[PDB]
Each structure stands twice: as C-alpha cells, then as structure tokens.
Amino acid sequence: TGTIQDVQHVVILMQENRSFDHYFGHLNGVRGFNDPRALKRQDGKPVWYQNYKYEFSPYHWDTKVTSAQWVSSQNHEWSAFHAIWNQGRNDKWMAVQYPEAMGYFKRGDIPYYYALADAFTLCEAYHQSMMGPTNPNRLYHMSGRAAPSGDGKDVHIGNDMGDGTIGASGTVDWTTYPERLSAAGVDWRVYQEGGYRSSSLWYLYVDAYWKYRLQEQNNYDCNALAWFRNFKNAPRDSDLWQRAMLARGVDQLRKDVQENTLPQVSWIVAPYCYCEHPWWGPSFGEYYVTRVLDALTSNPEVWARTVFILNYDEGDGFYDHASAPVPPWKDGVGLSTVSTAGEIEASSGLPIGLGHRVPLIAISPWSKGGKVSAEVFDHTSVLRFLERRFGVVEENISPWRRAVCGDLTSLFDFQDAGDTQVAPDLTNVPQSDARKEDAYWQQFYRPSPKYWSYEPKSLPGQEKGQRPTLAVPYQLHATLALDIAAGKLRLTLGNDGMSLPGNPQGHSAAVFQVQPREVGNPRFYTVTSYPVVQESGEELGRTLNDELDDLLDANGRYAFEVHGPNGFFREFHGNLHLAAQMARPEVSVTYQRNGNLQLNIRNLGRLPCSVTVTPNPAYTQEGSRRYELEPNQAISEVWLLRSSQGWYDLSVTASNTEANYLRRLAGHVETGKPSRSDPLLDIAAT
Numbered sequence: 171t172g173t174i175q176d177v178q179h180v181v182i183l184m185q186e187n188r189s190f191d192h193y194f195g196h197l198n199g200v201r202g203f204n205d206p207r208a209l210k211r212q213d214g215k216p217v218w219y220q221n222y223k224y225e226f227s228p229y230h231w232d233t234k235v236t237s238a239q240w241v242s243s244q245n246h247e248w249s250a251f252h253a254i255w256n257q258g259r260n261d262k263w264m265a266v267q268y269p270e271a272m273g274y275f276k277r278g279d280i281p282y283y284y285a286l287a288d289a290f291t292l293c294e295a296y297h298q299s300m301m302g303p304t305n306p307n308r309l310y311h312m313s314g315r316a317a318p319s320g321d322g323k324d325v326h327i328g329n330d331m332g333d334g335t336i337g338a339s340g341t342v343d344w345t346t347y348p349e350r351l352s353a354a355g356v357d358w359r360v361y362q363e364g365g366y367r368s369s370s371l372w373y374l375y376v377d378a379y380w381k382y383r384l385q386e387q388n389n390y391d392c393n394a395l396a397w398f399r400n401f402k403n404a405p406r407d408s409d410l411w412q413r414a415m416l417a418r419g420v421d422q423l424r425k426d427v428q429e430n431t432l433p434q435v436s437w438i439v440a441p442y443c444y445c446e447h448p449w450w451g452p453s454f455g456e457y458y459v460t461r462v463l464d465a466l467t468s469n470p471e472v473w474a475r476t477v478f479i480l481n482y483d484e485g486d487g488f489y490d491h492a493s494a495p496v497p498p499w500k501d502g503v504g505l506s507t508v509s510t511a512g513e514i515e516a517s518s519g520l521p522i523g524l525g526h527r528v529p530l531i532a533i534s535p536w537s538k539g540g541k542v543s544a545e546v547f548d549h550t551s552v553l554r555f556l557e558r559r560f561g562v563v564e565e566n567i568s569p570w571r572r573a574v575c576g577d578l579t580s581l582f583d584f585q586d587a588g589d590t591q592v593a594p595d596l597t598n599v600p601q602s603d604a605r606k607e608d609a610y611w612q613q614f615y616r617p618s619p620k621y622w623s624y625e626p627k628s629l630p631g632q633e634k635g636q637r638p639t640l641a642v643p644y645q646l647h648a649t650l651a652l653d654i655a656a657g658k659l660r661l662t663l664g665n666d667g668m669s670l671p672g673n674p675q676g677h678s679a680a681v682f683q684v685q686p687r688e689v690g691n692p693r694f695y696t697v698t699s700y701p702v703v704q705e706s707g708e709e710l711g712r713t714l715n716d717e718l719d720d721l722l723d724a725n726g727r728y729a730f731e732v733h734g735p736n737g738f739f740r741e742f743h744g745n746l747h748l749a750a751q752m753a754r755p756e757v758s759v760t761y762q763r764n765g766n767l768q769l770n771i772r773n774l775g776r777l778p779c780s781v782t783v784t785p786n787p788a789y790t791q792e793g794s795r796r797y798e799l800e801p802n803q804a805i806s807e808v809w810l811l812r813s814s815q816g817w818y819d820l821s822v823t824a825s826n827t828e829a830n831y832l833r834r835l836a837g838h839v840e841t842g843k844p845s846r847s848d849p850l851l852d853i854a855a856t
C-alpha cells in the first residue's frame with residue numbers, strides 16, 4: 171500500500187466556460203488579483219488596466235443585487251484567443267471581447283465552491299491545452315491530440331466533430347484512450363442522461379420558453395467519445411456502445427456506489443442546465459456537484475479508494491492575468507531543448523497552446539487541507555494520470571506536451587490515507603437545494619450587470635490569509651552576461667529539477683518568458699532537467715544559452731523582465747555602450763539545502779564600486795547590506811529566509827556605476843517539502 175496503486179476508482183467531471191480569476195480571483199493564498207509578479211504593459215501600468223480607447227479594470231459581480239448568474243456567453247474563437255495572446259504581451263484583452271468579461275465572483279455568490287476550495291486541493295496553474303473552442307479541448311482530453319497525425323498538419327481549430335444534435339456533425343478517426351482502456355481490460359464507463367440525439371436545439375437553444383427550467387435527460391453533445399468512427403458505427407449491442415454511450419443517471423451512480431460496483435474509471439458528463447455553461451449559473455453546477463459528491467460519499471469502502479477530479483474545458487472570454495507557456499513558432503523568439511513536432515499550427519503559424527487558466531479541484535482522502543499547487547497542468551495531465559495509475563501509455567501525446575505538463579501525482583499525498591469524512595454542509599443536499607431555488611427565483615429578475623454603471627474605484631483586493639502549498643520540481647537560474655567585445659547580451663538559462671516523493675527522480679520541464687519592458691518582442695524558452703537527444707545526434711538539455719540582440723536600443727539601453735513558474739522574477743536594467751570602460755557587477759544565486767539563500771556578486775571591471783542589497787520591506791526587517799567591491803573581486807552572502815516562509819525579493823544597486831543600473835531578484839526556494847503561499851499576495855496591489 172501507500173502508493174499511487176492504492177487508488178481504485180477515478181471520476182472525471184468536466185464543466186464549461188469558467189476561467190480561474192473569474193471564480194477564485196479573491197481567495198486567500200492563490201495567485202489572484204494581487205499577484206506581485208503581474209505582467210507590465212509598455213506604458214508602465216500593470217496589465218489589470220486594459221486600453222480600448224478607455225481604461226477598463228476588473229469588477230466584482232454582486233449576485234445579491236444583480237443577475238450575474240444569467241449572462242450570455244461571449245465570443246471565444248481561435249482568432250479572438252490568439253489576438254488576446256498577442257504573442258506574449260497579453261494586453262489586448264478588451265480589444266476583441268466585451269466589458270462584462272472582466273467581472274469576477276466572490277465568496278458571497280458561491281459558498282459551496284469556496285467551501286470546497288477551502289477544504290480541498292485547488293490548482294492555480296492549470297491551463298487549457300488549446301486556445302480555442304470546446305470540442306478541440308475535449309478532443310485533447312479524450313484522445314490527447316486534435317489531429318489525425320502528429321505532424322502538426324490538419325489539426326482541427328474550428329468546430330466540426332459532433333453527433334448531429336446541436337449543429338456539430340463531424341467524425342474523427344484516430345485512436346482514443348477509452349479504446350485502449352477496453353483493450354487493456356480496465357472497467358470504464360461514461361455517465362450521462364442520454365446517448366445519441368438526447369440533446370436538441372428545439373429544447374435548449376430557443377430560450378426553452380416551455381420550460382427554461384431544467385432538463386435532466388440530455389447531454390448537450392458533450393460526449394467526446396461519440397464523435398469517433400468506431401463508436402459512432404459500433405454494433406448497437408456491442409460492448410463499446412454499452413460501456414460508453416447510453417442513457418444513465420446520477421441516481422444510478424448512487425445505486426452503483428451503494429452496491430460496491432462502481433466502474434473503475436468514470437467520465438461524468440453533465441446536462442446542459444448544470445454544466446456551468448454561461449447560459450446557466452454557477453449555482454446549478456454547485457447543485458450537480460453536490461449530487462455527485464453525496465452519491466459518491468455514501469460508503470466507507472468506496473470513498474477510501476476514490477479520487478474525484480473537477481476541471482473545466484476552457485476559460486471562455488473571462489479575464490485571466492497570467493500568460494501561458496507556449497512553444498517557439500518562428501525565429502528570434504527563443505529556442506527549446508525539446509522538439510516541438512506537431513505543436514505548431516501549420517497554416518496559421520502561431521502555436522496552438524497552452525492557454526489561460528481554469529480551475530481544478532481534487533477531492534480525495536489524500537487531497538484535503540486546502541492546499542495550492544503551483545505546477546503547470548493541462549488537460550493531457552488527466553490522461554497522463556490514468557497512464558501512471560493503470561500503465562496503459564497513450565502514444566498520441568505530443569512530445570512537448572509530454573515534457574511540459576505534469577502527471578497530477580504531485581497533488582496527492584499517498585504516503586498516508588487520510589480517510590476521514592467530509593464536512594456535513596457540502597454533502598447536505600437540501601441547503602444547496604435552497605441555494606439553487608432562491609438563486610433561480612431571485613437572481614433571475616434582478617437587473618443585469620453592466621460596467622458603465624458599476625465601474626470600480628480600485629482594483630479588487632484579496633482575502634486575508636495564507637495557504638499551505640505543494641512542492642514543485644522547478645528550480646531555475648537566469649544569469650546575464652555582457653560581451654565586452656561584440657557588445658551583445660548573453661542569457662544563460664538553467665534548470666536542475668527537484669526530487670519529489672511523487673516524482674521518483676525529478677524529471678521536469680521549465681518554460682521561461684522574457685518580456686521587453688521598452689523595445690523588442692517577448693521571447694519564450696523551454697529547458698528540461700534531463701538530456702534530450704536531438705534528431706542530429708546532439709545532446710540538448712540542462713542548460714541553454716541565448717543572445718538577446720534585438721532587445722538593445724540604439725544607445726545600449728536594456729531593460730527587461732524574466733518570468734517563469736512559481737513566481738520566478740528577474741528584472742534586468744542598464745545600458746551597454748558607456749558601460750564598457752568602467753566596472754560592472756553581476757549577481758548569481760545558490761539555493762542552500764536548508765531553505766536559505768546564497769547571493770554572490772562578481773566584478774570583472776576596472777575600478778571599485780559600492781554595491782548595496784536592500785530587501786523588500788515586507789519579507790524582513792533587517793537593514794540593507796553594502797560592500798565596497800574592487801575590480802576582479804567577488805563576495806558571497808548567506809541570507810536566512812525561514813521567517814519569510816522561504817521567499818526572497820532582493821534589489822541590488824550600485825554606486826560609481828551606470829545610471830539606470832538596477833538588478834531585481836525574486837522567487838521561492840524549492841526544497842521538496844510543502845510550504846506556505848506568498849506573503850505578498852494580501853498586500854494591496856495598488
């Protein structure tokens with residue numbers, strides 16, 4: 171016992187069109203509306219201000235007075251999503267969307283979801299695989315690739331795949347993971363209220379004037395297994411059609427749980443009235459989650475070996491501030507040690523994914539405590555988790571997606587059981603029934619939310635408090651060097667990977683985003699903790715060297731930021747041409763074993779200079795330290811960080827040096843053990 175194999179039943183529930191900051195932008199301990207490493211626009215304001223001939227900012231939807239649970243969905247086409255992305259700038263959020271997409275909810279509107287988040291594990295770095303519509307994301311979730319072949323050509327980007335119910339009438343013909351599950355011999359099933367032709371336009375997309383209330387019989391064509399040739403043309407009495415595509419119910423799920431005959435792996439699909447789609451409120455999705463939870467938790471033996479994973483397909487047009495890792499798509503935009511075959515759209519040329527943030531909640535006896543996990547995951551991580559548990563490896567996973575995204579084994583603590591019960595409120599259906607009842611009956615008639623009448627006087631804050639967080643394998647180095655001969659900027663990016671209890675040795679892949687504050691274009695890098703054998707016989711990995719030639723101005727001015735995973739910040743400023751003929755310092759880092767930090771300052775110049783280190787006042791109260799460093803000199807300093815929860819933000823300045831010269835270092839020391847969240851989140855952003 172005590173391993174991943176102890177898990178026996180796995181349930182996957184997948185809702186629609188809810189971004190991260192829309193739900194948990196206020197929750198304490200998450201990288202929410204007050205991320206201190208927020209992206210900065212060209213004008214110098216943080217990205218929380220968006221310019222569309224006027225200044226737009228996020229605002230709090232207050233269901234107690236308006237109808238925020240009934241808002242029409244926005245436009246989230248592929249072109250719209252990529253124009254939002256803007257090749258890493260992420261600043262045209264209001265260019266294509268509409269103002270109402272900037273709203274966010276609070277605990278007063280969704281008590282059930284916030285109770286779940288406070289009680290169960292939440293991922294704040296979960297990204298959608300394709301920056302596009304629903305079906306391709308669900309195609310990735312059910313197959314692991316949205317193309318007939320893994321060469322990057324003919325990848326579906328619009329929407330054709332379907333079952334001829336709500337306008338989607340296509341058929342795709344590559345190997346699907348449930349087929350591998352059937353071939354292997356693992357019991358799998360799909361829970362939905364109806365099969366073929368259950369959903370109807372006449373029922374759901376005509377405002378449903380006859381009912382407009384509830385439909386517990388259809389499935390909204392969200393079954394991605396039904397779009398494949400083998401399934402769509404399987405024998406009517408065949409095993410595949412029995413296991414996958416039929417009519418079932420959540421009451422039958424409760425019956426199966428109480429009979430100790432739960433299918434090993436269950437895809438739970440939702441009816442349209444409950445699947446969180448913007449035509450319907452989050453309260454209905456809460457009620458369905460309550461039904462699933464009370465059905466599942468109705469037995470000790472079943473709950474002692476069950477893992478329930480709730481996630482969403484895409485974030486729709488709802489606002490999210492982070493910028494997702496992406497693979498290089500042309501020249502002059504960075505290099506990756508791992509071959510990006512099949513990850514780049516051939517016709518368009520821009521990369522497919524990954525995309526913005528969507529919530530992921532893990533409910534299991536091994537996933538309590540209200541923890542927050544900073545590793546980056548995509549839809550393929552679920553299939554990789556099934557691979558890790560059952561051993562059936564899906565080859566359809568693109569190599570870049572295999573390297574970048576994790577396998578969800580870092581969320582759960584399998585060294586124990588923790589088989590305790592769950593709070594009575596979340597399993598108590600009738601109060602959630604009351605919430606659904608007065609949500610439909612009251613918030614229906616309230617006026618709709620605007621932005622021209624509910625403009626915010628300030629950017630939204632965050633709930634007070636920290637949360638314990640889970641260890642991540644990312645430890646990074648980013649050093650800058652100036653070529654005194656060629657006058658170029660050389661960036662050394664490095665990774666090692668942290669050993670984990672869930673990761674036997676510590677394979678990991680990190681993505682770096684380099685943001686030009688003044689001039690240039692964002693440049694992305696992918697490094698890995700293991701060697702990668704390139705097609706030419708080389709051995710890439712563990713270290714990358716790049717040259718930032720195009721960032722320089724006409725007079726040598728350079729000013730840029732280096733981002734990453736888990737709040738890795740390195741801000742570099744200065745100038746080059748005049749810097750040649752006097753001294754210059756350089757800053758290097760070393761992660762001590764016991765969670766402390768070591769800072770080394772290296773001088774190769776010609777005259778002595780004084781260098782002062784002044785930490786941010788929030789983390790610690792000891793004073794700045796200054797050293798008079800000579801030419802060809804170096805000194806090392808040990809910085810204690812246990813009282814700051816193992817986070818650092820240092821500003822290194824110097825005298826007798828160039829103007830505008832300033833170095834900024836910031837991040838979290840990774841040691842392989844769970845720790846707390848960032849203390850700086852609850853400090854007001856502006």
Ligand SMILES: [Ca+2]
Pocket residue numbers: 185186187303304305483484
């Ligand atoms: Ca969707």
